[PDB]
């Protein structure tokens with residue numbers, strides 16, 4: 291306890307020795323308190339000017355305007371549960387490890403990742419680049435590094451905002467020890483069977499249709515209420531077992547990340563009463579986002595195999611596993627474990643499961659005792675399943691089967707169109723030039739052309755934005771699945787590569803010659819999913835689109851533009 295976290299606290303105490311007090315009106319119950327000390331979404335004008343009909347749709351316009359789950363506790367699982375998790379976790383790290391080798395990630399790999407801008411959850415230096423291009427940073431890194439090899443920590447402290455930011459250094463040390471899980475694709479579908487890491491939104495619907503082809507019961511897609519808060523100290527121990535597969539320095543650096551920063555956290559939170567609270571806890575998820583995704587995927591795979599074992603009668607009670615049950619659990623994993631992984635699609639806390647039969651629906655004792663309580667259903671009410679893979683929610687989408695005029699089959703991603711338009715009208719951060727705002731609009735437009743071409747309004751609005759932004763300007767994002775739309779290559783060429791040439795579910799490789807060969811949803815179904823077709827507002831927008839394109843061209847100025855509208859039958863004379 292205080293031996294592991296004391297140093298980090300001690301060091302914070304001294305930097306604010308002027309202001310340190312044990313505040314007695316501290317609002318924490320489950321978070322151990324230690325002391326205190328004194329300390330918006332912007333609109334994208336390019337996308338909004340080209341989506342006028344949505345200016346009067348509150349579900350779009352309200353998206354641009356504007357704890358009691360973190361400060362909760364999770365009971366210790368029973369002995370039977372703890373044994374089921376330990377056996378399953380041991381088995382799963384071995385399967386994931388059969389064709390992969392754990393290894394340290396490099397300064398070079400980190401330096402490259404920071405010099406191409408990604409989600410790093412980081413807070414003497416300004417930007418990430420400067421610190422990476424400074425030897426002093428690496429000496430600070432080196433000091434903590436040697437502290438970790440010595441089994442101690444001084445500067446690895448979380449800052450809450452839920453996202454848990456760290457100083458780049460602590461983030462580097464995290465990356466060095468555990469970055470291999472993402473960098474070497476441990477959660478790819480090929481390696482994990484249930485995972486979808488690196489798949490891409492143009493593959494997820496085909497993956498759910500392949501799960502639907504298995505014999506068995508309904509498709510279950512239960513969401514957990516606040517997954518990150520429900521990660522138990524036991525879950526963190528089972529995750530730590532990945533270190534059993536490591537050696538040398540790597541093994542020691544990884545054991546220190548798990549022991550010192552995951553299983554024993556130190557956090558700073560702003561309270562308006564404005565003070566800084568220094569709190570600690572031993573449970574809950576609070577890594578960096580990328581490691582969080584891989585370990586969430588691992589623990590979710592483990593939890594869903596145990597729920598499958600429960601439905602199949604492999605064990606009778608979570609109170610205690612008998613000696614023979616243990617062997618039966620091990621024998622089930624060796625005999626059918628890989629087949630049962632193949633019946634799932636798991637993306638962090640998000641799952642779809644097609645079990646052997648519907649006994650799964652009421653197999654709730656292990657799931658509830660592991661702390662993975664289902665959202666929006668009563669604790670002991672059986673899960674409701676989906677009879678049709680096209681209705682299943684996954685990764686905030688559903689999926690349509692769409693038949694091309696030439697007979698070939700596309701499985702396409704979809705979500706309510708108000709959500710798509712409302713997100714594309716939002717930027718994050720300050721100091722955006724008009725060029726940078728235009729290039730972010732172009733990134734949304736090209737994503738729409740590639741993923742949501744089947745939605746009449748989005749194909750039209752994507753064509754308009756690409757016509758309104760200079761043809762050679764490069765799409766950008768400030769935080770960056772696989773992003774095939776992030777390119778200045780011709781979008782028809784990219785569509786053909788993604789949906790025909792490289793699509794393993796498409797046997798006929800005949801290229802598509804124009805956008806008019808690429809189908810839409812049915813008119814009614816397109817309207818079900820939030821299309822504004824059949825509204826006078828939408829008809830006037832579509833008719834007068836060249837006027838809207840010309841307004842934006844006039845703002846940006848005298849640049850080289852292409853007209854993409856004649857790619858659509860209605861503007862093609």
Ligand SMILES: Cc1nn(C)c(C)c1NS(=O)(=O)c1cccc(F)c1
Pocket residue numbers: 813814817823824825
């Ligand atoms: C020109 C038009 N104006 N109106 C009022 C309607 C029904 C149409 N036809 S439509 O093909 O655009 C269409 C739109 C929405 C749903 C649907 F099933 C069909």
Ligand SMILES: [Cl-]
Pocket residue numbers: 675676677678681
């Ligand atoms: Cl259904």
Ligand SMILES: [Zn+2]
Pocket residue numbers: 434438442443444445446460550
């Ligand atoms: Zn540390």
Ligand SMILES: [Zn+2]
Pocket residue numbers: 688690704705819
């Ligand atoms: Zn849809």
